[PDB]
Design a protein around this ligand. Structure first.
Ligand SMILES: *[C@@H]1O[C@H](CO)[C@@H](O[C@@H]2O[C@H](CO)[C@@H](O[C@@H]3O[C@H](CO[C@H]4O[C@H](CO)[C@@H](O)[C@H](O)[C@@H]4O[C@@H]4O[C@H](CO)[C@@H](O)[C@H](O)[C@H]4NC(C)=O)[C@@H](O)[C@H](O[C@H]4O[C@H](CO)[C@@H](O)[C@H](O)[C@@H]4O[C@@H]4O[C@H](CO)[C@@H](O[C@@H]5O[C@H](CO)[C@H](O)[C@H](O)[C@H]5O)[C@H](O)[C@H]4NC(C)=O)[C@@H]3O)[C@H](O)[C@H]2NC(C)=O)[C@H](O)[C@H]1NC(C)=O
Ligand SMILES: *[C@@H]1O[C@H](CO)[C@@H](O[C@@H]2O[C@H](CO)[C@@H](O[C@@H]3O[C@H](CO[C@H]4O[C@H](CO[C@H]5O[C@H](CO)[C@@H](O)[C@H](O)[C@@H]5O)[C@@H](O)[C@H](O[C@H]5O[C@H](CO)[C@@H](O)[C@H](O)[C@@H]5O)[C@@H]4O)[C@@H](O)[C@H](O[C@H]4O[C@H](CO)[C@@H](O)[C@H](O)[C@@H]4O)[C@@H]3O)[C@H](O)[C@H]2NC(C)=O)[C@H](O)[C@H]1NC(C)=O
Ligand SMILES: *[C@@H]1O[C@H](CO[C@@H]2O[C@@H](C)[C@@H](O)[C@@H](O)[C@@H]2O)[C@@H](O[C@@H]2O[C@H](CO)[C@@H](O)[C@H](O)[C@H]2NC(C)=O)[C@H](O)[C@H]1NC(C)=O
Ligand SMILES: *[C@@H]1O[C@H](CO)[C@@H](O[C@@H]2O[C@H](CO)[C@@H](O)[C@H](O)[C@H]2NC(C)=O)[C@H](O)[C@H]1NC(C)=O
Lengths: 159, 292
């Protein structure tokens, strides 16, 4: 098992962390979901799918930066919605192919009432995701830390 | 000045005692604060006259002196403060695991075992197939190390595994690790489909693909089993390494059932199969050592 970002950043066998740069809407109104489709940005694969069957969960999802203070929302994991920041571990995802497959995670973030201006600044950390991997073979428990940064500014108009 | 002592018995254990022509003086050393006659355990860092430690380092008291212990990777040289030094060169500053490589960093030393191993710097539990060539990860005592399978393999002399041995009942759930076949147990893994109810097992297993050239590395190969009127309905993967001396070592792994067992080919170290009867004509043919 090894993972890489759409931008090429990779984490070797053993676990680690990687930086995931995502694009965001330059303006979002109060009451409208900001959508961060992270399934297009994080890809993983099975290095030996002939025998071992690996299970992958989101152990913890937490808001950071402008999202933690000016937004609230949910995380869509494997098609099901869960609170964000997360309060429970998400179900296991089976990876059974050497072909890289998306990590099914999408953030739906709704701004809170704001005086106005730029809520999320470019270069700021907007989320941290801890990928947890288990299997049915042994006690593999590797942590893959995804540091989610905004490429652009997000204006929240007064409302 | 005020701590002239009549006898050495007046000096406390926190003070050093000097006999100068039987005149005794009690002078406590840096790291103890007092008048000399009696001193208490208190860091010299706050004496009158103060201390002279580097700002980055933290002033601490040691048994016999107060000391300036830098963050690791640096050591104090009197007069220069924290001086750059590779603590990994000194066995009194770095206590890494023998296989782990000490690397020097700002504020610590870090023991890092070489790339490929899985560990926290002290116990790098490697996985089989991650080691460099000529070596593979095997247990030694209570830890995992990369070693040459040609010297760490087990050996088997189970004559029941021969392809003509149809009588019996077996289960290879106990086979794990590196193995070798010797004697009547055959020279190498069987490379062809073996009929059902052979090799003293219900369903026989055989190697699909040929053994590699001598001193070829660890290559994954496929393996098949025969049951019912179909052969290699299920396909597995095994690894074979060639060794000096003309023998092969094999990654034997338990099967999915309890009626599967690996067959072995006859060693055939003879050009003529004189262990067969003279009335059972030996067929000396290339790749087909047999008698009929
Ligand atoms: C081990 O046990 C075997 C019993 O199953 C025994 O027979 C072997 O059986 C294999 C399973 O079908 C077979 O693999 C496939 O065979 C197809 C046809 O066989 C080709 O090769 C023969 C010589 O080996 C020739 O006589 C044939 O004429 C034929 O020749 C051409 O070969 C080309 C390249 O090999 C192909 O491009 C052509 O299609 C083929 N025909 C013509 C007219 O040109 C192959 O088509 C097949 O190709 C695979 O790869 C292609 C490219 O990626 C792909 O398009 C195919 O779909 C096919 O994909 C799948 O590949 C898997 C491995 O990557 C394979 O699984 C494993 O195959 C192993 C092969 O040794 C082994 O059997 C293992 O247990 C399998 O799990 C899939 O089977 C395969 N999918 C399909 C549908 O087949 C591929 O070569 C072996 O060739 C055949 N070997 C023979 C007959 O000698 C073995 O003898 C035995 N080995 C021992 C004892 O050492
Ligand atoms: C004897 O063989 C048997 C098999 O019949 C074996 O039993 C099990 O074998 C499987 C398969 O190896 C083990 O499962 C996986 O093993 C992985 C380690 O090796 C595999 O992956 C390698 C990936 O690259 C690594 O190694 C290279 C150097 O080779 C290095 O540069 C990389 O950075 C990285 O470290 C791959 O290279 C390797 O292939 C080499 O070795 C094989 C032989 O093993 C050889 O045939 C090849 O030609 C090549 O030389 C091999 O493919 C391990 O990483 C992996 O763990 C990850 O994946 C699983 C599954 O996705 C995840 O669950 C896990 O979290 C990790 O992400 C997995 O362990 C399995 O562990 C064996 N079972 C046991 C009990 O050992 C025996 O162990 C072998 N040895 C003995 C003594 O019997
Ligand atoms: C005695 O101290 C001087 C200067 O030390 C400064 O004052 C101390 C009270 C303490 O606060 C130190 O951290 C101060 O730096 C030593 O001369 C060097 O001075 C430079 C700049 O001031 C400093 O960067 C070096 O680390 C000092 N060298 C050391 C601390 O070894 C002088 O060497 C000290 N005498 C010794 C240690 O015998
Ligand atoms: C704080 O620690 C740093 C490094 O841990 C010290 O920097 C070193 O200083 C020595 C002496 O000048 C140099 O030889 C090294 O090359 C420096 N290393 C690095 C990484 O900068 C620094 O001196 C310490 N602070 C003080 C006040 O001594």
């Amino acid at each position: 098992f090894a993972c890489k970002t759409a931008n090429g950043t990779a984490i070797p066998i053993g676990g680690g962390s990687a930086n995931v740069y995502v694009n965001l809407a330059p303006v979002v109104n109060v009451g409208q979901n900001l959508v961060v489709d992270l399934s297009t940005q994080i890809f993983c694969h099975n290095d030996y799918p002939e025998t071992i069957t690996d299970y992958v969960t989101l152990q913890r999802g937490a808001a950071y930066g402008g999202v933690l203070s000016s937004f609230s929302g949910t995380v869509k994991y494997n098609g099901s919605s869960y609170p964000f920041p997360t309060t429970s571990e998400t179900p296991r995802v089976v990876y059974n192919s050497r072909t890289d497959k998306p990590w099914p995670v999408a953030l739906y973030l709704t701004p809170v009432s704001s005086a106005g201006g730029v809520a999320i600044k470019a270069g700021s950390l907007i989320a941290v995701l801890i990928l947890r991997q288990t299997n049915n073979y042994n006690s593999d428990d590797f942590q893959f830390v995804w540091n989610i940064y905004a490429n652009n500014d997000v204006v929240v108009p007064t409302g | 000045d005020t701590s002239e002592a009549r006898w050495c018995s007046e000096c406390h254990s926190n003070a050093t005692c000097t006999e100068d022509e039987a005149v005794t003086t009690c002078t406590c050393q840096e790291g103890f604060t007092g008048d000399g006659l009696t001193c208490v355990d208190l860091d010299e860092c706050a004496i009158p006259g103060a201390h002279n430690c580097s700002a980055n380092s933290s002033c601490v008291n040691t048994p016999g002196s107060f000391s300036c212990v830098c963050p690791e990777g640096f050591r104090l040289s009197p007069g220069l403060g924290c001086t750059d030094v590779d603590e990994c060169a000194e066995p009194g500053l770095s206590h890494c695991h023998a296989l782990a490589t000490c690397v020097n960093v700002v504020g610590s030393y870090l023991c890092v075992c070489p790339a490929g191993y899985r560990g926290d710097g002290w116990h790098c539990e490697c996985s089989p197939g991650s080691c460099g060539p000529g070596l593979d990860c095997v247990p030694e005592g209570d830890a995992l190390v990369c070693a040459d399978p040609c010297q760490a393999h087990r050996t088997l002399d189970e004559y029941w595994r021969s392809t003509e041995y149809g009588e019996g009942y077996a289960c290879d759930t106990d086979l794990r690790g590196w193995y070798r076949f010797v004697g009547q147990g055959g020279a190498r893994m069987a490379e062809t489909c073996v009929p059902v109810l052979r090799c003293n097992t219900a369903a026989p297993m055989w190697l699909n693909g040929t053994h590699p050239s001598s001193d070829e590395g660890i290559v994954s190969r496929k393996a098949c089993a025969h049951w019912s009127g179909h052969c290699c309905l299920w396909d597995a993967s095994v690894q074979v390494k060639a060794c000096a001396g003309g023998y092969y070592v094999y990654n034997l792994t338990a099967p999915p059932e309890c009626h599967l067992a690996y067959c072995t080919d006859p060693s055939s170290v003879e050009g003529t199969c004189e262990e067969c009867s003279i009335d059972e004509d030996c067929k000396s043919n290339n790749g087909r050592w047999h008698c009929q």
